[PDB]
Amino acid sequence: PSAGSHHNDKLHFKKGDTVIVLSGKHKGQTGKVLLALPRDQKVVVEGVNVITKNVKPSMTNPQGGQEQRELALHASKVALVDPETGKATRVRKQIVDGKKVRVAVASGKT
Amino acid sequence: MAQINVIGQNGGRTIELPLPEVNSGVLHEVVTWQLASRRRGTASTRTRAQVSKTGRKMYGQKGTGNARHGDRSVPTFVGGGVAFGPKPRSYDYTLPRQVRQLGLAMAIASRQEGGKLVAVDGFDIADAKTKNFISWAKQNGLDGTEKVLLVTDDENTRRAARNVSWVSVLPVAGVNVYDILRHDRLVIDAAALEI
Amino acid sequence: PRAKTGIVRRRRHKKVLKRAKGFWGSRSKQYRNAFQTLLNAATYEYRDRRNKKRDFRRLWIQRINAGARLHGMNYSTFINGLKRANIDLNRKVLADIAAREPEAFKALVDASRNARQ
Amino acid sequence: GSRKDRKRVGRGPGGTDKTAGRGHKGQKSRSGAGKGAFFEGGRSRLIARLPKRGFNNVGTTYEVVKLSQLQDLEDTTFDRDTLEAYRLVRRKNRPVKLLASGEISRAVTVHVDAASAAAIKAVEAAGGRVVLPE
Amino acid sequence: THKMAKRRIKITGTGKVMAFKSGKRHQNTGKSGDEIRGKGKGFVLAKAEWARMKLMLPR
RNA sequence: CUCAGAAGGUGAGAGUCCUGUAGGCGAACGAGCCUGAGUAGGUCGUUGUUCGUGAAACGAUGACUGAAUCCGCGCGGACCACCGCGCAAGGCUAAAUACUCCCAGUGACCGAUAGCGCAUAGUACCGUGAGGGAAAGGUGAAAAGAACCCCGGGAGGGGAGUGAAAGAGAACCUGAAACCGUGGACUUACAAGCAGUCAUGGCACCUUAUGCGUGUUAUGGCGUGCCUAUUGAAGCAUGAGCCGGCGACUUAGACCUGACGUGCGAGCUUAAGUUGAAAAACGGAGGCGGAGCGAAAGCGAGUCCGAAUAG
RNA sequence: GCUGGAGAUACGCUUUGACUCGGGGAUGUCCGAAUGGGGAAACCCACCUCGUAAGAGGUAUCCGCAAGGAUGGGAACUCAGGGAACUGAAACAUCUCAGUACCUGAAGGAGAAGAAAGAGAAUUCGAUUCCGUUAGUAGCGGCGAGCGAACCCGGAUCAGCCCA
Ligand SMILES: [Mg+2]
Ligand SMILES: [Mg+2]
Ligand SMILES: [Mg+2]
Ligand SMILES: [Mg+2]
Ligand SMILES: [Mg+2]
Ligand SMILES: [Mg+2]
Ligand SMILES: [Mg+2]
Ligand SMILES: [Mg+2]
Ligand SMILES: [Mg+2]
Ligand SMILES: [Mg+2]
Ligand SMILES: [Mg+2]
Ligand SMILES: [Mg+2]
Ligand SMILES: [Mg+2]
Ligand SMILES: [Mg+2]
Ligand SMILES: [Mg+2]
Ligand SMILES: [Mg+2]
Ligand SMILES: [Mg+2]
Ligand SMILES: [Mg+2]
Ligand SMILES: [Mg+2]
Ligand SMILES: [Mg+2]
Ligand SMILES: [Mg+2]
Ligand SMILES: [Mg+2]
Ligand SMILES: [Mg+2]
Ligand SMILES: [Mg+2]
Ligand SMILES: [Mg+2]
Ligand SMILES: [Mg+2]
Ligand SMILES: [Mg+2]
Ligand SMILES: [Mg+2]
Ligand SMILES: [Mg+2]
Ligand SMILES: [Mg+2]
Ligand SMILES: [Mg+2]
Ligand SMILES: [Mg+2]
Ligand SMILES: [Mg+2]
Ligand SMILES: [Mg+2]
Ligand SMILES: [Mg+2]
Ligand SMILES: [Mg+2]
Ligand SMILES: [Mg+2]
Ligand SMILES: [Mg+2]
Ligand SMILES: [Mg+2]
Ligand SMILES: [Mg+2]
Ligand SMILES: [Mg+2]
Ligand SMILES: [Mg+2]
Ligand SMILES: [Mg+2]
Ligand SMILES: [Mg+2]
Ligand SMILES: [Mg+2]
Ligand SMILES: [Mg+2]
Ligand SMILES: [Mg+2]
Ligand SMILES: [Mg+2]
Ligand SMILES: [Mg+2]
Ligand SMILES: [Mg+2]
Ligand SMILES: [Mg+2]
Ligand SMILES: [Mg+2]
Ligand SMILES: [Mg+2]
Ligand SMILES: [Mg+2]
Ligand SMILES: [Mg+2]
Ligand SMILES: [Mg+2]
Ligand SMILES: [Mg+2]
Ligand SMILES: [Mg+2]
Ligand SMILES: [Mg+2]
Ligand SMILES: [Mg+2]
Ligand SMILES: [Mg+2]
Ligand SMILES: [Mg+2]
Ligand SMILES: [Mg+2]
Ligand SMILES: [Mg+2]
Ligand SMILES: [Mg+2]
Ligand SMILES: [Mg+2]
Ligand SMILES: [Mg+2]
Ligand SMILES: [Mg+2]
Ligand SMILES: [Mg+2]
Ligand SMILES: [Mg+2]
Ligand SMILES: [Mg+2]
């Protein structure tokens, strides 16, 4: 049944990266990446979020009520923008350390 | 019969133009065949009980109170086999060469009655870069509001190709009636082998 | 390439069904019994068309002598004396004048009366 | 313009769809159906009734060269032994014989496998000759 | 067909079909009249429509 | 920007957002004097190839016999002579050929009665067994999948809320028809009917629409379902409960024969294949006209029957 | 980042490089050619050897001196032993269906075939297989239904090597 496997299930950005909402609601809001799920997409960022009425049945308290929690997202938003912009940064480079690769566009690192 | 090239006239263009202006009948005979030949024959159909899966016999003929039919693999049955379905055909044949020759003659002549372009020394492409192709065409009156068919040698000059639209490369005279007729205009570039 | 029957039959059927309106019971609602009855209707339409002509003729006539006999004549006599006078080519829908215009039809009667006998 | 490309004006019709009112319900009426036996039929066919034994054989058969072809039209150019192309013999692998059809007085030299004596009459009587292999 | 091959039903220049003559053939002749030596080549094209496709490579 | 414009994903249709694509690179470990004897040859029983015992050659064996050695031997369709072609009774051998469990790519192939039987199942179910054998789909862009209140044991629904939409709420895309109902309009309880049709009146309506109107209805005239099968069908002769969907004149071949159309036309055309494919050229082996008559030899604008000419 | 589809709470594991790979290994219970012996598959009962129990190894036939080889399983394809009938002939015996279906055996990724006691009628060709063509031609046949070559030529591929 397909499902998000269209991209090569390689993820741009990373676990902690700061990033901008591309399209969608908000759009240009930012947040540190909370959860990255390569298979299914599903970026968790500090941005747009929905009020979740929690399931009435519970072992602890009758409770329910409504948590705020999170709204997960696709590759629908941007990736790790350095140069004071919402730029989509293609290039990698072997620069700085001879180990890591730092994606930049008009600029360096990220 | 009348053309000025990119390097300046090649000694002149004459060739010939099978008057009256082309012909639509003989043309359409060609392209019909053309597409017909290139057509890939393929079909999925299940015939009857050999090709479907049923086997055996059914409730028995007389005295069941219901209809006669002896098997479930037959066309009159849902989930059954199919009668007169498509099979893996061919659709190919040999159009008489006389007409195949005559076809694109007419078709080349169809571009001559209208806008027609031939070139030598199109070297302005400057390797490939695809951009100088856009310039070379632009300097030559090719807007991009027309779809062009580039036919030539010198693969570098072809290696700049395939624009947002309108640009189609057709190497070293594999030219056919279809492609040149479907396009807005044609650039045969090199007049060599177009002798 | 298969081409299924889709969206063709349904439109045609409904096209028939809609012709059937005041049709009683199954006649209106289900196609097969609706389609035929139109078969028979064809017979009733085409034929009744040239018949209403017949009907009306006998209706006009039926009026004419009703008026004629009121004056002591009859359709046969009246139509003849009116014919026996080239004067009145009146003929068609003479009944209108018979029913609606009594004083008129009378003068029309005596003309027939006179130019006959 | 590809879309402007027209028909042939009566190159050909569509086939026959036998499913409809107006022209359907076809074949014969009875016993004309589900078929595949047919051809010629009966009691005792004419063929079997008719006599023969005869032969088959068909040995040597000759490529004909019409005499009018050489003389008069063209140059009467002395077709020689193998003219072949530009001349009328094609399939060959069979001997060639020269027969009298058309005639004029002009010289000729013909190499053939055989010829009619009444043709070979007119070959020399116009001047020239017909030669045969040893 | 192979039937009319050494048999009758010969085609001609015009395409017409040639029939031999039957009665009598190799037996039961006797009698008198010429007629014995009078069974020759003959034809009709009425039936012959159906005899063309039976053997046409040759005449 | 383009050596990259193929393609799929992203809240709706992106060349420049993502994955990609053109192009470039890439591994330790991997994987590509002789020369054939119980035989050739034969007789009997048979069979193979076009070979049906036929004038039956030759191969091949079941049963009986049973040779020559090169101043030899087998074949050339009974057999003989001449003339030729070939050396049996020892074996092995890549390549061009076939098929598709399996992987890839493409499609004037299907799109949930289609396509494989299965949008997974040889499962459910049937059979002691061999064996046979199903139907199958869709919330949303995202679960944000409905905390909370109300009636009810529940089921189920009414709110609130989320969402563009709950006219998507989990018996979740569209949702036709048969079939069941609710409300309204005009109608119906002395009337004999294939259910209609025609004419007029009555009531109601007014978005192709105030007329040649739509809907309904009363009254009058007319009026023997449909199909098949038949000399003849409303037939008390066949078929059908109704609606949906499935469902029947096709494809093949260097085939045959006609018509129309086209290109070359005293000529016309290639097949297998080779090469090149974002496309086609190449390929004369062969085929069809071109001469007929005869049983055939054969002869030839002639031929055939025959001594001629009569045909 | 991960902690199979599994969707669900928990315990967690991971830059000392997880997970997902690509490629070698290592363990691989019992049944099944099953093969220690038995046996209504996947369970019962044994003998020998190394030994501290735990446990590991062996114990079927067939070719051979031995190394070693063979049993069994394959969708269709190949070759071989065996070999139908319906049907057609407008009935039916020869004939056709057809050496098709099925059965059995063997084998491989292919197989079969092959290096002229040949084809043939030019004193020509030149192992085999395959395609086109010859050609519905020669012929076969209750001379019925119907069956139906090869040689020349054009192609695909082209190798001949060894023993008595
Ligand atoms: Mg019943
Ligand atoms: Mg199916
Ligand atoms: Mg489709
Ligand atoms: Mg009527
Ligand atoms: Mg009248
Ligand atoms: Mg009147
Ligand atoms: Mg058709
Ligand atoms: Mg018609
Ligand atoms: Mg019938
Ligand atoms: Mg009859
Ligand atoms: Mg019948
Ligand atoms: Mg049948
Ligand atoms: Mg036949
Ligand atoms: Mg003849
Ligand atoms: Mg896209
Ligand atoms: Mg834009
Ligand atoms: Mg020897
Ligand atoms: Mg022998
Ligand atoms: Mg014998
Ligand atoms: Mg016999
Ligand atoms: Mg023999
Ligand atoms: Mg001797
Ligand atoms: Mg002999
Ligand atoms: Mg001989
Ligand atoms: Mg091989
Ligand atoms: Mg299905
Ligand atoms: Mg369904
Ligand atoms: Mg099944
Ligand atoms: Mg089963
Ligand atoms: Mg049971
Ligand atoms: Mg979903
Ligand atoms: Mg519910
Ligand atoms: Mg509830
Ligand atoms: Mg609702
Ligand atoms: Mg809805
Ligand atoms: Mg529920
Ligand atoms: Mg939707
Ligand atoms: Mg729905
Ligand atoms: Mg009420
Ligand atoms: Mg009601
Ligand atoms: Mg009463
Ligand atoms: Mg009443
Ligand atoms: Mg009544
Ligand atoms: Mg009236
Ligand atoms: Mg109103
Ligand atoms: Mg009435
Ligand atoms: Mg019917
Ligand atoms: Mg009767
Ligand atoms: Mg009657
Ligand atoms: Mg009845
Ligand atoms: Mg009956
Ligand atoms: Mg009944
Ligand atoms: Mg055929
Ligand atoms: Mg042909
Ligand atoms: Mg063939
Ligand atoms: Mg023609
Ligand atoms: Mg011409
Ligand atoms: Mg999951
Ligand atoms: Mg990874
Ligand atoms: Mg055991
Ligand atoms: Mg055992
Ligand atoms: Mg063992
Ligand atoms: Mg097997
Ligand atoms: Mg029988
Ligand atoms: Mg029979
Ligand atoms: Mg038999
Ligand atoms: Mg087998
Ligand atoms: Mg084996
Ligand atoms: Mg062949
Ligand atoms: Mg050859
Ligand atoms: Mg060779």
PDB file of N, CA and C (backbone and C1' of nucleotides) and ligand atoms in Angstrom, chain F residues 254-256 287, ligand 54:
ATOM      1  P     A F 254       1.976 -17.821 -43.673  1.00  0.00           P
ATOM      2  O5'   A F 254       2.672 -17.044 -44.882  1.00  0.00           O
ATOM      3  C5'   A F 254       1.942 -16.659 -46.041  1.00  0.00           C
ATOM      4  C4'   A F 254       2.334 -15.275 -46.505  1.00  0.00           C
ATOM      5  C3'   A F 254       1.688 -14.786 -47.794  1.00  0.00           C
ATOM      6  O3'   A F 254       0.376 -14.283 -47.602  1.00  0.00           O
ATOM      7  C1'   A F 254       4.008 -14.361 -47.871  1.00  0.00           C
ATOM      8  P     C F 255      -0.622 -14.092 -48.852  1.00  0.00           P
ATOM      9  O5'   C F 255      -1.441 -15.459 -48.905  1.00  0.00           O
ATOM     10  C5'   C F 255      -0.811 -16.688 -49.242  1.00  0.00           C
ATOM     11  C4'   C F 255      -1.825 -17.743 -49.608  1.00  0.00           C
ATOM     12  C3'   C F 255      -2.928 -17.299 -50.556  1.00  0.00           C
ATOM     13  O3'   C F 255      -2.529 -17.270 -51.914  1.00  0.00           O
ATOM     14  C1'   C F 255      -3.886 -18.471 -48.746  1.00  0.00           C
ATOM     15  P     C F 256      -3.118 -16.139 -52.891  1.00  0.00           P
ATOM     16  O5'   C F 256      -4.602 -16.630 -53.191  1.00  0.00           O
ATOM     17  C5'   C F 256      -4.854 -17.909 -53.749  1.00  0.00           C
ATOM     18  C4'   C F 256      -6.334 -18.140 -53.894  1.00  0.00           C
ATOM     19  C3'   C F 256      -7.097 -17.035 -54.603  1.00  0.00           C
ATOM     20  O3'   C F 256      -7.027 -17.154 -56.009  1.00  0.00           O
ATOM     21  C1'   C F 256      -8.250 -17.668 -52.630  1.00  0.00           C
ATOM     22  P     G F 287       9.719 -18.117 -58.108  1.00  0.00           P
ATOM     23  O5'   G F 287       8.555 -17.150 -57.620  1.00  0.00           O
ATOM     24  C5'   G F 287       7.603 -17.608 -56.673  1.00  0.00           C
ATOM     25  C4'   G F 287       6.639 -16.519 -56.298  1.00  0.00           C
ATOM     26  C3'   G F 287       5.812 -15.963 -57.436  1.00  0.00           C
ATOM     27  O3'   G F 287       4.735 -16.811 -57.777  1.00  0.00           O
ATOM     28  C1'   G F 287       6.637 -14.188 -56.106  1.00  0.00           C
TER      29        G F 287
HETATM   30 MG    MG H  54       1.224 -13.845 -52.165  1.00  0.00          MG
END
